[PDB]
Amino acid sequence: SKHSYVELKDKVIVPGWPTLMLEIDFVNQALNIPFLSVKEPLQLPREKKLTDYFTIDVEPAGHSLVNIYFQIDDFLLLTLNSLSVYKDPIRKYMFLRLNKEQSKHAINAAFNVFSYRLRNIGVGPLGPDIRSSGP
Amino acid sequence: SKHSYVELKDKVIVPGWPTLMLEIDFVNQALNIPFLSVKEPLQLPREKKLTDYFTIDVEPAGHSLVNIYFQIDDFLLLTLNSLSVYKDPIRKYMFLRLNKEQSKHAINAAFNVFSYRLRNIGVGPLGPDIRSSGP
Amino acid sequence: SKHSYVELKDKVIVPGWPTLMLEIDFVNQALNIPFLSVKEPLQLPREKKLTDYFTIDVEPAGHSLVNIYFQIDDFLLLTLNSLSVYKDPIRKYMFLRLNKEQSKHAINAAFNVFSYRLRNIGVGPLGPDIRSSGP
Amino acid sequence: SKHSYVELKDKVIVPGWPTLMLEIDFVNQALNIPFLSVKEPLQLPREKKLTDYFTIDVEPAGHSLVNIYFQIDDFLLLTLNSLSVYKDPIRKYMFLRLNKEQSKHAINAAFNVFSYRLRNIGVGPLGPDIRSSGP
Numbered sequence: 001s002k003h004s005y006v007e008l009k010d011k012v013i014v015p016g017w018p019t020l021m022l023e024i025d026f027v028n029q030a031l032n033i034p035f036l037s038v039k040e041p042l043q044l045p046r047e048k049k050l051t052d053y054f055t056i057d058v059e060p061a062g063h064s065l066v067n068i069y070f071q072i073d074d075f076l077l078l079t080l081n082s083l084s085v086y087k088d089p090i091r092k093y094m095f096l097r098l099n100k101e102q103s104k105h106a107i108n109a110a111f112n113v114f115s116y117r118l119r120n121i122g123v124g125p126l127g128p129d130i131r132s133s134g135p
Numbered sequence: 136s137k138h139s140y141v142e143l144k145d146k147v148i149v150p151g152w153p154t155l156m157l158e159i160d161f162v163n164q165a166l167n168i169p170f171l172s173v174k175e176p177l178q179l180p181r182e183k184k185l186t187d188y189f190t191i192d193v194e195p196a197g198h199s200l201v202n203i204y205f206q207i208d209d210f211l212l213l214t215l216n217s218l219s220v221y222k223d224p225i226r227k228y229m230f231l232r233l234n235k236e237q238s239k240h241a242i243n244a245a246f247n248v249f250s251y252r253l254r255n256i257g258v259g260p261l262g263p264d265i266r267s268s269g270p
Numbered sequence: 271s272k273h274s275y276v277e278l279k280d281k282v283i284v285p286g287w288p289t290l291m292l293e294i295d296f297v298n299q300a301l302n303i304p305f306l307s308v309k310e311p312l313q314l315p316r317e318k319k320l321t322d323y324f325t326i327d328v329e330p331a332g333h334s335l336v337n338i339y340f341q342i343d344d345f346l347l348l349t350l351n352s353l354s355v356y357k358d359p360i361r362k363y364m365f366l367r368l369n370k371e372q373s374k375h376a377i378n379a380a381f382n383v384f385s386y387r388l389r390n391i392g393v394g395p396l397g398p399d400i401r402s403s404g405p
Numbered sequence: 406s407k408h409s410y411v412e413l414k415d416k417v418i419v420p421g422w423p424t425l426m427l428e429i430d431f432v433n434q435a436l437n438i439p440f441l442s443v444k445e446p447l448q449l450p451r452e453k454k455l456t457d458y459f460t461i462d463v464e465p466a467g468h469s470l471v472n473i474y475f476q477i478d479d480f481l482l483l484t485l486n487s488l489s490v491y492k493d494p495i496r497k498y499m500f501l502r503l504n505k506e507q508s509k510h511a512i513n514a515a516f517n518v519f520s521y522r523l524r525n526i527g528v529g530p531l532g533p534d535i536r537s538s539g540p
């Protein structure tokens with residue numbers, strides 16, 4: 001059956017919360033993207049690798065604008081939704097847009113992806129106040 | 136007779152398809168641009184070079200915004216339209232806009248072009264699904 | 271009590287006036303931001319350091335867009351408002367937006383901040399005329 | 406008397422014409438900007454330098470957005486208007502906006518300007534056709 005690749009909008013990143021970063025290596029060309037804001041650091045089951053539940057696709061959408069496509073298996077998308085700060089946003093088929101700044105890196109690397117991992121990034125000293133004190 | 140240089144809009148790049156890249160060398164300054172999405176890799180006839188049917192022009196259009204102009208001969212523009220994913224878009228007289236990120240490279244190189252080639256770039260692992268599964 | 275982190279909009283920078291720069295060091299990754307336009311260079315009291323009245327927080331707000339959060343104590347926010355060119359803009363709880371160009375630097379450094387100082391930057395030769403001759 | 410610094414809009418650059426470039430050196434940090442499209446290369450009178458009729462001012466207008474201010478004397482602004490492609494655009498008091506890409510360079514150099522010159526840049530091979538064939 002047909003399935004929409006749903007956009008992982010910027011709202012899945014909420015300031016003042018810990019976030020997990022999507023690190024991508026290309027050929028020497030890097031890419032670091034705030035993937036999702038979480039309320040607990042992700043742990044892939046003991047000896048299992050990220051490659052099992054998660055596969056990415058870096059593809060051009062214009063003359064200098066690139067997208068990243070995601071294939072997220074049940075076990076990860078259930079873990080990710082439970083760790084997420086914003087209401088369960090992660091779908092099985094997803095994509096996020098790279099801005100013209102980042103897109104250049106992916107194009108200069110001919111969209112070829114060598115390796116990719118998710119890493120837990122901590123929060124700042126004012127973090128506690130940032131989240132609790134909203135407009 | 137007068138002739139409009141038609142804009143090669145970003146829609147001629149459709150994600151999940153193989154694409155050919157316009158590689159430009161300047162002086163040491165590079166430029167890599169997704170030129171057109173194709174459904175078969177381009178082959179210039181055996182021993183003939185790209186210089187014969189295709190000549191480019193890098194020109195400024197503002198204070199930090201540059202354009203690239205194209206002169207495409209019959210043989211190439213017929214081949215390109217047949218390989219294209221989107222409905223026959225390529226005209227004899229064309230131009231595409233570089234964003235402020237890329238424009239800087241062309242300006243820093245004083246618009247001088249040393250060499251330029253078209254290269255066939257493959258598709259990702261999720262590629263098959265990307266094209267077939269549209270919004 | 272609840273408190274809004276008020277945005278330090280770009281209007282607090284008025285051309286033709288001396289400005290103080292927020293210099294941030296990350297890990298080797300730098301950041302230089304025009305913080306506030308002043309009409310007298312700031313001096314932290316003799317032997318006291320900036321760390322006492324001023325603490326920053328670098329946090330992501332999207333997939334490639336970062337914010338900087340400020341905790342400004344009474345003594346500094348009173349000094350800063352008095353030195354400011356624009357009407358007393360500085361609040362106790364503040365934030366300013368980094369553009370996609372700068373945000374990339376903060377993300378590539380994993381939001382980690384090593385050191386940060388405020389520095390007084392002089393005005394140009396036409397400066398006197400710039401401020402006095404407004405549209 | 407009061408005088409408006411008039412904006413040198415991007416329209417003073419018309420594609421397919423030779424252009425003169427404003428080259429600025431800072432501290433090691435560079436800046437290359439298409440200044441004005443001309444129909445004849447500029448020549449400063451024999452042994453006279455550009456410093457005599459032309460003085461620039463690099464000033465911040467926001468948190469990551471910079472402007473460049475111009476003081477153009479009679480002799481140069483008369484020469485420049487006569488060489489210009491677009492209708493006499495150059496005024497005595499002028500400014501042009503740097504985009505977020507370029508602004509970063511000026512800020513990282515603390516707005517300090519070491520040297521600046523105007524250089525005549527040639528036109529491409531399709532140049533003749535570009536200008537004559539307009540939309």
Ligand SMILES: Nc1ccn([C@@H]2O[C@H](COP(=O)(O)O)[C@@H](O)[C@H]2O)c(=O)n1
Nearest residue numbers: 028029030031032102105106108374378
């Ligand atoms: N995501 C990023 C961020 C920065 N960069 C920078 O672009 C440069 C490209 O590599 P070269 O300098 O070897 O050409 C890297 O050295 C790196 O500093 C990158 O390649 N990918």
Ligand SMILES: Nc1ccn([C@@H]2O[C@H](COP(=O)(O)O)[C@@H](O)[C@H]2O)c(=O)n1
Nearest residue numbers: 104108163164165166167237240241243
């Ligand atoms: N299209 C691109 C993309 C990146 N770059 C980067 O800009 C740098 C400019 O050269 P220098 O470092 O020698 O000044 C290159 O090393 C390269 O990494 C470029 O010149 N053109």
Ligand SMILES: Nc1ccn([C@@H]2O[C@H](COP(=O)(O)O)[C@@H](O)[C@H]2O)c(=O)n1
Nearest residue numbers: 298299300301302372375376378509513
């Ligand atoms: N705010 C800024 C401005 C420029 N840069 C540049 O990005 C580069 C990143 O470091 P590497 O070249 O060592 O990867 C620095 O060398 C620096 O020239 C930066 O890291 N932060």
Ligand SMILES: Nc1ccn([C@@H]2O[C@H](COP(=O)(O)O)[C@@H](O)[C@H]2O)c(=O)n1
Nearest residue numbers: 239243433434435436437507510511513
């Ligand atoms: N206008 C420009 C364009 C590029 N750059 C690049 O930014 C770099 C900044 O210098 P460092 O690498 O020495 O930090 C330069 O090497 C240069 O390649 C610049 O400084 N000004």
